[PDB]
Design a protein around this nucleic acid. Structure first.
Ligand SMILES: [Fe+3]
Length: 176
DNA sequence: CGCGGACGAAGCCATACCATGTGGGCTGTCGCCTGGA
C-alpha cells in the first residue's frame, strides 16, 4: 500500500503547517543511531548489549527501529482529527471517546501487529518492548489484557484501511 | 466518709469546548288535545 503523507506528527507552533508522521519516525530513529554511536559510552553499550544477548550491530539496529516506532500510535482518528484534516478517504473507526493518548495507542497496538515480523506471539520480548516504547511520555502502561480472541478489534482497531496504513508505516520504517 | 456523674485519654486524616420533544371522558327531552285504533 502506498504510504500517505497527510498524517501529522507535530503541530504545535508550526504557523499553520503540518509535519508528516513518517519523517518524524525516521529522523527519530536516526537520532537513536547517532546517539548510540556518538553519545552513549562503549561500556554501557556492552552492558545493554550483553543483557539482551545481542551485539552492538543488531542491538543498535533494533533500538533504532524501536525509536522509529515510538509515535506510531498517532495513527488513530482522535489524534489527527484534532484539527481540520480530511478523513472521508477511509471510513470506519468512529469516535468512541476513550481519551487514549498516542503513547497508549502504540503501547496497546504493537503487541499484536509486529508478530508478522518475527517476534513470538504472546512472548515476553514483544511485551517489554511494546510497553517500553508505548510509555514514551514518562508514564508506563500495563501489559495488554484482552478477553476476546480478536484483540486488534477489541481495542478499537477495526477498520482494515487504517490497519493497512499502519502496517505500511511499520514495514516502511522496518526496511528503512 | 462514701460516692454520682461526667469527662477525657487517642487512634484517626489523604514534556513533545456542545443537549432534549408531550398531552384526551361526561350528560340528559317533550306540545297538547281529540280521534281512532
Ligand atoms: Fe511522542
Amino acid at each position: 500500500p502506498p504510504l500517505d503523507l497527510r498524517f501529522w506528527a507535530k503541530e504545535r507552533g508550526l504557523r499553520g503547517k503540518t509535519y508528516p508522521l513518517v519523517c518524524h519516525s525516521l529522523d527519530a530513529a536516526a537520532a537513536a543511531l547517532v546517539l548510540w554511536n556518538e553519545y552513549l559510552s562503549p561500556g554501557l553499550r556492552d552492558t545493554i548489549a550483553s543483557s539482551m544477548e545481542t551485539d552492538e550491530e543488531h542491538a543498535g539496529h533494533c533500538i533504532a527501529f524501536w525509536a522509529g516506532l515510538h509515535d506510531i500510535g498517532k495513527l488513530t482518528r482522535e489524534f489527527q482529527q484534532q484539527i481540520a484534516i480530511d478523513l472521508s478517504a477511509y471510513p470506519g473507526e468512529e469516535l468512541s471517546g476513550e481519551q487514549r493518548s498516542h503513547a497508549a495507542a502504540t503501547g496497546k497496538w504493537l503487541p499484536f501487529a509486529l508478530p508478522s515480523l518475527g517476534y513470538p506471539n504472546g512472548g515476553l520480548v514483544t511485551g517489554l518492548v511494546a510497553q517500553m516504547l508505548g510509555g514514551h511520555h514518562g508514564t508506563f502502561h500495563p501489559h495488554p489484557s484482552f478477553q476476546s480472541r480478536n484483540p486488534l478489534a477489541e481495542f478499537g482497531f477495526s477498520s482494515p484501511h487504517w490497519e493497512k496504513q499502519r502496517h505500511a508505516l511499520l514495514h516502511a520504517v522496518f526496511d528503512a
